[model samples]
Target: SKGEELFTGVVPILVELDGDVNGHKFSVRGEGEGDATNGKLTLKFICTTGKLPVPWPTLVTTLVLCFARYPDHMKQHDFFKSAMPEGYVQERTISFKDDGYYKTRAEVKFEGDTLVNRIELKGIDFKEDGNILGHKLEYNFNSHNAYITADKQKNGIKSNFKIRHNVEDGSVQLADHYQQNTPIGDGPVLLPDNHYLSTQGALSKDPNEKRDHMVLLEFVTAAGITLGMDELY
Candidate 1:
């Protein structure tokens, strides 16, 4: 390595995953960890042009087909202009063609006693035509909004198939997770090398700012690995 120093702080390109953390309110359990008779750590993080990062979700979508950037104002859109149920943050810095680059952490909290809040997620950036191909990630999310409102509960969420698949024959399929290659309208499904992790917010709406139609519900990955990317141990 040249200066011998690679990332260890601040680097989030885009992140706006919302409500119940997607899947209509969190509860995802992937497979292959122990020994399905003999399945060593998901076969050493997998091979065969797949399973390197792939966490079944989070692949920079809602629009960012290699140009990257789709997380606009949800409370305190960071880059240093904070806002949230209480506290928030954001940052970005680039420089890594092939030396190093992979940082993402979304730390959500909602303390009480007096009331404290936090929602930190520091990573995500993937450029294809511009050349920066990596799923990018960072995990952190918070709770305790007390009375947060987004109101669109009529069809608040119930499967018209904009996207919701649970394949491998166990049965669970619904499509329409629309994405026209670029325009940021929900698009993420790339598994040939497992480089995408964290995306399951299950689109929402109804805080009724006049039918504001909220989002933050998503689900993907016919393959697995990623509940905030552990095993960096």
Candidate 2:
């Protein structure tokens, strides 16, 4: 029983959740290759039945979190990269630690599409410190260029949180955000400046440059299952 192969050709983790957000029915599903070190994941989300209930900016914020990357997939950033194909993607072959936690990147392209969203997530290094439910993630971000009558940075995106939670009703209340161990205050809240997910403008000049102001993530799930992790000796 020691040497056994439970699954091959990429053992996968799967998640299917359905509920509501502010009275709107919502559903989210994700699939990832277990053993995150070199694997990948994808999430598809839908809200309500007839039309998109969320505003454009809110949707944009969610997309940025789910699919933007820092320094387009090359050199230092090569170990991982993400995308939004109608959704998003992340690819990497880095270690099981260190770069592993930062393996997932983001990208966004609507392709003249509507509110329907499809996202692909990959390159997450599944480690002991990181579990399927919740883990703390942090990063530094500085995206200038949207300044001084100058050209925007070719690609500048250092991003935020990798949060996970389980819910029965799928309401926004079940999805939570925290500053490390401290829970955010009750009532409407946005991402605070001290948060790892907050992005600062590159050489910013805006009055609210580093101010903590951004809505909490809509939903971020790297859901999946594992298999065949036993010895072969």
Candidate 3:
């Protein structure tokens, strides 16, 4: 049985780093691809020092800091410029359209340079709807929640996970329904009513303390996920 093709295209990601980490500049270039019908997604990233000398340890640290600080950067927009050692220059642009495709592009000086470091993610599950690999998946834009549940129960407990986003707070929360709303992760919202980019962190119990375990993601797709329903206002 074949499924409808929800989305197909490449997403370009570019992040520039500067300020006192190693007294030099660095940048991250990445590309991602997704096939909704086949339930697969892939990402490849390369970090470069741009002709500046950087030690291996400092280079690795810079990359990690960028991911950790990206969510905060998104909220305030200019917050990243002043944050030292983790500072990044936002050079990419994203614009949503009625046809479901978003216009995205990035400009960098070190596009053709040899990679100093690399990260690759291949064959990640990105099933927008239906069942895949013993799990039942469902997407509901009206309720702003997507669900994944294990088909088989274990010890009379059903394993169910929910990905929920709150437009009011611009935050996305992942909770385990079986564990009484166990907070799996939380992050600032990056996409419109869909599971695209997530910069997640573990939800904190205290309101005063912010979520610190940041994981940055930015999916600039040629087309967005399709639900075959009228657009919700």
- Candidate 1 residues 1-233, lDDT tens each? 11001111211222233222111222221111111111111201111222323223232222111111112211111111111112222111212333222232222111231111111222233243222223232221111111111112221111111223333344332223221111111222121212222223333333533421222322222122223434333
Clashing pairs in 3: none
RMSD vs true structure, all candidates:
21.7, 20.9, 21.5
TM-score of each: 0.18, 0.22, 0.20
Best by TM-score: 2
lDDT of each: 0.21, 0.24, 0.23
Looking at candidate 2, the ten consecutive residues that score lowest on lDDT are 143-152
Once fitted onto the true fold, the runs of candidate 2 whose alpha carbons sit more than 4 angstroms away are: 1-102, 116-118, 128-130, 133-233
- Which candidate number would show the highest lDDT if scored against the true structure? 2
Q: Locate the minimum summed-lDDT window of 10 residues in model 1.
A: 1-10
| Residue-by-residue lDDT tens digits, candidate 3, 123-152 | 122232212111222212222221212112
Clashes of 3: 0
